[PDB]
Design a protein around this ligand. Structure first.
Ligand SMILES: Cc1cc2cc(c1)C(=O)N[C@@H](c1ccccc1)C/C=C/COC[C@@H]([C@H](O)CNCc1cccc(C(C)C)c1)NC2=O
Length: 373
């Protein structure tokens, strides 16, 4: 696993990617790591934002599946043609597998100018693959075709980080690993049982936190919350930070807030705790996130007399999304073999006053199931 450490790169706010090769002879591409979807897809024709792309006609091992595919995400969409080819991860396990690949031929608001990645690795389950669940996802192929154990973990550092395939690297975290069940195998779906802001409970029925599912998604930046939960959370964050007033556009994630370089007032912003269902009845643990995680710096030389930030919590109409802002400075273990997700504090986490945490146990008397439907 040391060979896999620091195998992820990224531009701030533009996506974490791993190097892969596709085809025979190997064509090198940088591929976005996405636990929020299940299609492996690569740019396969010119695009103003791509420095390189998959050339199927140079690969003797390419097999055309004679089927088109269209994938509309929350942000962005693409379409292209299915086939299969040999794939390897130079800084992953030492194996070469034959995998499904979508050759993207048209796209809209999907590739990002300057992001350095040319494709996406959907690491979730076949139930949400397009065009349907018969298209085996990459990680499934890898496990079936090799001896790699059925689990991977991600340490995203807010850029670089590590994707450890087939295991857990103890150098990447401290303290204990706490596990929450994967509720259903489609997305990495989990259940939040409680939310607090500065230790104050939001006080809603816990099904609202999971309306109509809650997922762990490395392919989305923000923590995204159902409308009712989002409005409650903003109200409580505004209340805690009320010594300064910000425009509504800031709270809507449409406008930056800036402070003279070095003077960001971290202390006025609250910590947010998300309590995740535990492995034992009515037990939970919490992960705590600091404003350094949910106020995302926007690098722009033009504004660089200041430190400028966007509010990285937003409203969702498709359930909770624990995006990269939540994953950053946790080590997150996708323990597919045991149908659970592990969290620990990451070696790449804080202030001289507060530190992000993963801790438990917490018990609740309330017998409600927090799962939505
Ligand atoms: C609002 C928003 C949504 C999404 C991405 C971003 C922003 C974004 O800004 N992402 C960038 C990034 C930067 C820094 C860190 C992490 C990500 C770069 C990543 C692009 C890849 O997009 C991946 C996609 C992810 O699969 C979504 N999962 C739920 C889902 C919803 C609908 C359909 C489907 C499947 C089943 C087809 C899944 N993310 C976004 O939609």
């Amino acid at each position: 696993f040391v060979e896999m450490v620091d195998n992820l790169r990224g531009k701030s706010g533009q996506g974490y990617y791993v190097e892969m090769t596709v085809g025979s002879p190997p064509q090198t591409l940088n591929i976005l790591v996405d636990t929020g979807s299940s299609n492996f897809a690569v740019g396969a024709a010119p695009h103003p934002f791509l420095h390189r792309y998959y050339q199927r006609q140079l690969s003797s091992t390419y097999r055309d599946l004679r089927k088109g595919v269209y994938v509309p995400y929350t942000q962005g969409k693409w379409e292209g043609e299915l086939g299969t080819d040999l794939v390897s991860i130079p800084h992953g396990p030492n194996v070469t597998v034959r995998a499904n690949i979508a050759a993207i031929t048209e796209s809209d608001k999907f590739f990002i100018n300057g992001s350095n990645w040319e494709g996406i690795l959907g690491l979730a389950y076949a139930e949400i693959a397009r065009p349907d669940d018969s298209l085996e996802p990459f990680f499934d192929s890898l496990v079936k075709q090799t001896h790699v154990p059925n689990l991977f973990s991600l340490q995203l550092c807010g850029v670089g980080g590590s994707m450890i395939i087939g295991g857990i690297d103890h150098s990447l975290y401290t303290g204990s690993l706490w596990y929450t069940p994967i509720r259903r195998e489609w997305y990495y779906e989990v259940i939040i049982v409680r939310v607090e802001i500065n230790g104050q409970d939001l006080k809603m029925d816990c099904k609202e936190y999971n309306y109509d599912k809650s997922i762990v998604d490395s392919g989305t930046t923000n923590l995204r919350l159902p409308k009712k939960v989002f409005e409650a959370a903003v109200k409580s964050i505004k209340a805690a930070s009320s010594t300064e007033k910000f425009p509504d556009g800031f709270w809507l994630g449409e406008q930056l807030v800036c402070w003279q370089a070095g003077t960001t007032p971290w202390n006025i912003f609250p910590v947010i705790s998300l309590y995740l269902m535990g492995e034992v009845t009515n037990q939970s643990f919490r992960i705590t996130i600091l404003p350094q995680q949910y106020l995302r710096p926007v690098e722009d030389v033009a504004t660089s007399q200041d430190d400028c930030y966007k509010f990285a919590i937003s409203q969702s109409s498709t359930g909770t999304v624990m995006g990269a802002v939540i994953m950053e400075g946790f080590y997150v273990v996708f323990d597919r073999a045991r149908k659970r997700i592990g969290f620990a504090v990451s070696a790449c986490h804080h202030d001289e006053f507060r530190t992000a945490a993963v801790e438990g146990p917490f018990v609740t008397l309330d017998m409600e199931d927090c799962g939505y439907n």
